[PDB]
Amino acid sequence: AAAA
Amino acid sequence: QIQSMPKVKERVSVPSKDDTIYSYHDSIKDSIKAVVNISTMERALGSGVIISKDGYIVTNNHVIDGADKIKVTIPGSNKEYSATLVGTDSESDLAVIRITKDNLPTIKFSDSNDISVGDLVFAIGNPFGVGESVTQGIVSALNNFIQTDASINPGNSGGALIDSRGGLVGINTAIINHGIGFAIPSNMVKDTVTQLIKTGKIERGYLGVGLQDLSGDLQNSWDLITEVNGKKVKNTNELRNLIGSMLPNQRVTLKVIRDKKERAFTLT
Amino acid sequence: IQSMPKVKERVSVPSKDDTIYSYHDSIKDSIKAVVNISTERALGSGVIISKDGYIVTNNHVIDGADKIKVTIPGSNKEYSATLVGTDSESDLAVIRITKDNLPTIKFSDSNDISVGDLVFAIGNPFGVGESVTQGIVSALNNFIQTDASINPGNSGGALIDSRGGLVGINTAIISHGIGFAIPSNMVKDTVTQLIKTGKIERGYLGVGLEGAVVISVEKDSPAKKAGILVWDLITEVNGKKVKNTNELRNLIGSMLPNQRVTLKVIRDKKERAFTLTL
Amino acid sequence: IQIQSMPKVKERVSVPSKDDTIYSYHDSIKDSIKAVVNISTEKMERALGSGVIISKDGYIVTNNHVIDGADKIKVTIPNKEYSATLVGTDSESDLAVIRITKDNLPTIKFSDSNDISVGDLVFAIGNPFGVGESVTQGIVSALFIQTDASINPGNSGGALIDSRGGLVGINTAIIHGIGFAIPSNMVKDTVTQLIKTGKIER
């Protein structure tokens, strides 16, 4: 649900 | 001034021989051996499709969601195999499981981006681990989701949607009549089951910006917390980053600085 | 007792590794003429008739629509359409858009089709893409019965043959696994009479539910002027005796209006009346 | 993993693309339609179901549940109104045999149901309301015989024919899109005993  | 078709002179049917029948069996005889049953048979749950010689299987996420001891049955044999969960994508309704068997009949993937409406397709499923269950139809509509007038039911869910070559064009997905069913396209299935087998789950990608589309305010046309910006078609940017896959490289486009920015989608 | 020779051969489609079996080439051109009927959310599909801008639909697709809009499948966006006519008794209606060089649906002879003909039901549910269904001709009566799924997306859309020629216009009827469509000969006749006049081939119908019971007598109608009160039971139109309501509605529709007919009414006692249909 | 993709699609095969010819299964199912009768009662919304003629002298097979509870059964051939009589029943197989008093009736020929396979083209013929026939196209889904052709109360007791037009089964409408039918080889044995003896022993 998140990263970069 | 209504245009009209010529008069119908001839009428072509199937072979009119008293000796021969018309069938689709040869076109589907091989793919049926790669569609398996999935149980915990009196009380079964959905079907599945073998995708690897060494024992990897695809099904719907809703087919398996909740079970504790997944068992499969293969066309032939009649022996039950213990299956272990590999991955489960909730958004795509896809899951991968594995059994300990070699030289299994596998299914070959067709390119779901080369199909047209009207293509002959077959929905294969193994609802109760005793035999097959094929339904016939056509590709009704295209895109993300394949609509077909072939019977897609809980018995067929998780099963194989093949073309006339037996190649997998999608995975059946029963949702809740209209006589129209849905199937997850094979290209999407191919990408998901690789990520589920390799990394164990589906890794998306996240920028940290809220997007919106321009309609009347058309002008000339960070990461950790928040932002509310615009972009051209604020639907493709979310798909480009969800496919960006965790910690890659980033490119962007101009407007001003940080918030109230405009991202133009193009290259890498 | 009589049995068949045991089957020896079994033929299929091509099914080569390079080759798929697909009706796409047979349906490719007929899809372009199936547009979407929008209001002001959309709910229906239509077929282009004139090369333009004349479009056929069902009458119940637009019955009570604020503003007709037509999304056509030519990589185009929402056109504006005006009403041309609405034949209530045939569930047909025509609309017109200001556009030329449009794909037109060539009509096929509805009297040539027989049970078992390969047919396809094309629709345009939301203006984003077509919606083809595959099936055969299930039965002929006065509509067409099809086992190809007819749904609200298909309603007013094209029912075609293997050549891509219009054999019917799809009509959805409150949900079975059997769909119905209006024959193409009836559509072509009803559409031409709608683009010329307002299309009408009947007079009054002041009636409703031993013949047919009158339920309502419209104001300023041939039935009221003649003296047909409510609860009258029309038994015989001219000479032919009427069994029920549908039999009576057939006779009044066959008459080209503004012609003289005498009726037989039984309000406890048989009372005849001469009228002039409107 | 090692996902095995298939070759790209190069060519697309359809039906004859001629503008003067249509593709249609009529010439194959026209003869079998003549043998599928309607089954109503004496006391239009009198319909019970359908049946097929199996002998030229008037034998008709149908479902046991179609005629369960009737005065004497009225049969309509695709003609008008013929009185029938019960020859035999078998609720286990859900098959019934009735007889009308006509001659040289259109007969239905039986196919060996042990030769059909999953994927064979089949048509479900039925005479729902005596005013005409109703046919639906599908395939053999599984081997009862499972099919994706429509099997509704109008088809119950009617014919399930192959591409030739021979009987591969008698429809049974079990009140999604999975109809059923009793294989023709079992119908062959059941109607033979129901005509000989009153019913089936076993």
Give the separation between CA C3 and CA D107, rounded to whole angstroms.
10
Cα distance from B94 to chain D (closest Cα, Å)? 16
Residue where the block lists tokens 């509704």: D152
Give the separation between CA D94 and CA B132, rounded to whole angstroms.
24
Cα distance from D28 to chain C (closest Cα, Å)? 9
10 Å CB burial of residue B187 (0-12, 13-18, 19+) is middle
How far does CA C242 lie from the centroid of its chain? 26
- Cα-only R_g, chain B: 23
Bridge partners of B23, per DSSP, are: D120
Cα distance from B52 to chain D (closest Cα, Å)? 7
Give one word for C242, left, alpha or beta, with left for phi > 0 and alpha for psi -120 to 50. Answer: beta
Question: Which of B25, B26, B149 is nearest residue C133 as measured by Cβ atoms?
Answer: B149
Query: Residue C172: how many CB atoms within 10 A of its CB?
Result: 21
Give one word for C272, left, alpha or beta, with left for phi > 0 and alpha for psi -120 to 50. Answer: beta
Question: Searching chain B, which residue's CA lies closest to the CA of residue C147?
Answer: B179
Q: Record the resolution, in angstroms.
A: 3.1
Give the long-range contacts of residues C85-89, CB within 8 A, separation 24 or more. C85/C194, C85/C195, C85/C198, C85/C199, C86/C59, C86/C62, C87/C59, C87/C190, C87/C194, C87/C199, C88/C59, C89/C202, C89/C249, C89/C253
Candidates C3, C15, C17, C20, partner chain D, best to mutate (most D CBs within 10 A): C3
User: Which amino acid appears at position C170 of this protein?
Assistant: N
Determine contact, residues D15/D21, Cβ cutoff 8 Å.
no
Bridge partners of C121, per DSSP, are: C133, C159
User: What dihedral angle (degrees, nearest 10) is formed by the CA atoms of C257, C259, C262, C265?
Assistant: 20
Contacts with C138 from chain D: Cβ below 8 Å: 134-136
10 Å CB burial of residue C94 (0-12, 13-18, 19+) is buried
Give one word for D163, left, alpha or beta, with left for phi > 0 and alpha for psi -120 to 50. Answer: alpha
Which residue segments constitute the domains of chain D, with CATH numbers given? 1-202 (2.40.10.120)
Residue where the block lists tokens 């005793």: B130
Contacts with B122 from chain C: Cβ below 8 Å: none
Q: Is C153 helix (H, G, I), strand (E, B) or coil?
A: coil
Q: What element of type H or E holds C229?
A: none
Cα-Cα end-to-end distance for chain A: 11
Determine contact, residues B205/B248, Cβ cutoff 8 Å.
yes
Give the separation between CA C132 and CA C148, rounded to whole angstroms.
9
Give the separation between CA C246 and CA D73, rounded to whole angstroms.
28
Token pair of D199 as six digits:
């019913």
Catalytic residue among C30, C90, C155, C184: C155
Residues of B labelled as active-site residues: 62, 93, 157
Question: Searching chain C, which residue's CA lies closest to the CA of residue B143?
Answer: C129
**Number of residues assigned to chain A:** 4
Longest dimension (CA), chain C: 80
Cα distance from D74 to chain B (closest Cα, Å)? 33
Closest by Cα among C49, C64, C45 to C191: C49
DSSP letters, D52-91, are EE-STTSEEEE-HHHHSS-SS-EEE-----EE--EEEEET
Give the separation between CA D141 and CA D121, rounded to whole angstroms.
10
| Subunit contact A4:B223, Cβ cutoff 8 A | yes
Determine if residue B23 is labeled as part of a ligand binding site: no
Token pair of C222 as six digits:
């041939």
Question: Determination technique for this PDB entry?
Answer: X-ray
Cα B109 to Cα B49, B53, B166, C253, D119, distances in angstroms: 11, 14, 9, 58, 21
Bridge partners of D160, per DSSP, are: D124, D169
Give the separation between CA D168 and CA B70, rounded to whole angstroms.
37
Closest by Cα among D143, D198, D132, D130 to D169: D143
Give the separation between CA C68 and CA C84, rounded to whole angstroms.
12
User: What is the DSSP code (8-state) at residue C105?
Assistant: -
Bridge partners of D123, per DSSP, are: D137, D161
Token pair of B238 as six digits:
């979310």
Residue where the block lists tokens 């004859």: D16
User: Residues of C at the D interface (Cβ-Cβ below 8 Å)?
Assistant: 1-4, 6-7, 10, 13-14, 16-26, 114-118, 135-141, 145, 147, 161-163, 176-178
Question: Searching chain A, which residue's CA lies closest to the CA of residue B222?
Answer: A4
Candidates C13, C109, C138, partner chain D, best to mutate (most D CBs within 10 A): C138
Closest by Cα among D159, D133, D138 to C115: D133
User: Which amino acid appears at position B8 of this protein?
Assistant: V
Question: Searching chain A, which residue's CA lies closest to the CA of residue B224?
Answer: A4
Q: What element of type H or E holds D125?
A: strand D121-126
Give the separation between CA B163 and CA B136, rounded to whole angstroms.
10
Residue C223 φ then ψ, to 5°: -75, -40
HSE at residue C123, side-chain half, CA atoms within 13 A, is 27
Cα-Cα end-to-end distance for chain B: 54
Give the separation between CA C118 and CA B13, rounded to whole angstroms.
10
Candidates C7, C21, C104, partner chain B, best to mutate (most B CBs within 10 A): C21
Cα distance from B89 to chain A (closest Cα, Å)? 12
Contacts with B4 from chain C: Cβ below 8 Å: 106-109, 188
Chains that touch C (3 or more CB pairs under 8 A): B, D
| Subunit contact B246:A1, Cβ cutoff 8 A | no
Token pair of B12 as six digits:
């072509």
Residue where the block lists tokens 């010689």: B53
Closest by Cα among D92, D65, D122 to D199: D92
Longest dimension (CA), chain B: 78
Token pair of C195 as six digits:
């683009």
Token pair of D133 as six digits:
């026939």
Q: Is C218 helix (H, G, I), strand (E, B) or coil?
A: coil
Cα distance from C136 to chain D (closest Cα, Å)? 7
Give the separation between CA B173 and CA D169, rounded to whole angstroms.
30
Token pair of D117 as six digits:
């396979």
Determine contact, residues C184/C108, Cβ cutoff 8 Å.
yes
Question: Which of C2, C24, C117 is nearest residue D109 as measured by Cβ atoms?
Answer: C2
Query: Residue D33: how many CB atoms within 10 A of its CB?
Result: 24
Give residues with Cβ within 8 angstroms of C208, minimum separation 6.
Answer: C214, C215, C216, C245
Determine contact, residues C114/C140, Cβ cutoff 8 Å.
yes
Contacts with C15 from chain B: Cβ below 8 Å: 26-27, 164-166
Determine contact, residues C6/C98, Cβ cutoff 8 Å.
no
Closest by Cα among B132, B180, B186, B138 to B156: B132
Determine contact, residues B98/B86, Cβ cutoff 8 Å.
yes
| Subunit contact D110:C4, Cβ cutoff 8 A | yes
Give residues with Cβ within 8 angstroms of D79, minimum separation 6.
Answer: none
Q: Is B88 helix (H, G, I), strand (E, B) or coil?
A: strand
Cα distance from C74 to chain B (closest Cα, Å)? 16
Residues of D labelled as active-site residues: 65, 94, 156
Determine if residue C177 is labeled as part of a ligand binding site: no
Burial code (b: 16+ CB inside 10 Å, e: under 16) for C3-22 equals ebeebeebebbebeeebbbb
Determine contact, residues D179/D171, Cβ cutoff 8 Å.
yes
3-state SS of D137-184 is: EEEEEECCEEECCCCCCCCCCCEEECCCCCEEEEEECCCCCCEEEEEH
Token pair of C150 as six digits:
């007819």
| Subunit contact B147:C133, Cβ cutoff 8 A | no
Determine contact, residues D107/D54, Cβ cutoff 8 Å.
yes
Bridge partners of B85, per DSSP, are: B97
Question: Which of D17, D112, D177 is nearest residue C26 as measured by Cβ atoms?
Answer: D17
User: Which amino acid appears at position B118 of this protein?
Assistant: G
Determine if residue C91 is labeled as part of a ligand binding site: yes
User: Which amino acid appears at position B208 of this protein?
Assistant: G
Give the separation between CA C134 and CA C138, rounded to whole angstroms.
12
| Subunit contact B131:D120, Cβ cutoff 8 A | no
Residue B241 φ then ψ, to 5°: -85, -35
Give the separation between CA B31 and CA B124, rounded to whole angstroms.
8
Give residues with Cβ within 8 angstroms of C26, minimum separation 6.
Answer: B118, C120, C162, C163, C164, D14, D15, D17
Please, what sign has the CA dihedral across residues C32, C38, C44, C48?
negative
| D47-53 and D86-90 beta bridge pairing | unpaired
Give the separation between CA B263 and CA B245, rounded to whole angstroms.
19
CA angle (C149 as vertex; C168, D29 as ends), nearest 5: 75
Determine contact, residues D26/C116, Cβ cutoff 8 Å.
yes
Residue D199 φ then ψ, to 5°: -145, -155
| D167-172 and B80-89 beta bridge pairing | unpaired
Candidates B206, B209, B241, partner chain A, best to mutate (most A CBs within 10 A): B206
Question: Which of D20, D27, D177 is nearest residue B135 as measured by Cβ atoms?
Answer: D177
User: What is the DSSP code (8-state) at residue D118?
Assistant: T
Question: Which of B7, B134, B197 is nearest residue D119 as measured by Cβ atoms?
Answer: B134
Q: Is C12 helix (H, G, I), strand (E, B) or coil?
A: coil
Give residues with Cβ within 8 angstroms of C101, minimum separation 6.
Answer: C51
| Subunit contact A3:B223, Cβ cutoff 8 A | no
Residue where the block lists tokens 């919106």: B212
Give the long-range contacts of residues C265-272, CB within 8 A, separation 24 or more. C265/C228, C265/C232, C265/C233, C265/C234, C265/C235, C266/C211, C266/C232, C266/C233, C266/C235, C267/C229, C267/C231, C267/C232, C267/C233, C270/C235
Give the separation between CA C89 and CA C142, rounded to whole angstroms.
12
Determine if residue B151 is labeled as part of a ligand binding site: no
Query: Residue B117: how many CB atoms within 10 A of its CB?
Result: 24
How far does CA C102 lie from the centroid of its chain? 22
Question: Searching chain D, which residue's CA lies closest to the CA of residue B151?
Answer: D177
User: What is the DSSP code (8-state) at residue B23?
Assistant: B
Cα C213 to Cα C209, C220, C244, C249, C263, distances in angstroms: 5, 20, 8, 12, 13
Give the separation between CA D99 and CA D137, rounded to whole angstroms.
29
Determine if residue C111 is labeled as part of a ligand binding site: no
Determine contact, residues B246/A3, Cβ cutoff 8 Å.
yes
Closest by Cα among C248, C253, C212, C214 to C231: C214
Residue where the block lists tokens 């005006």: C82
| Subunit contact D119:B151, Cβ cutoff 8 A | no
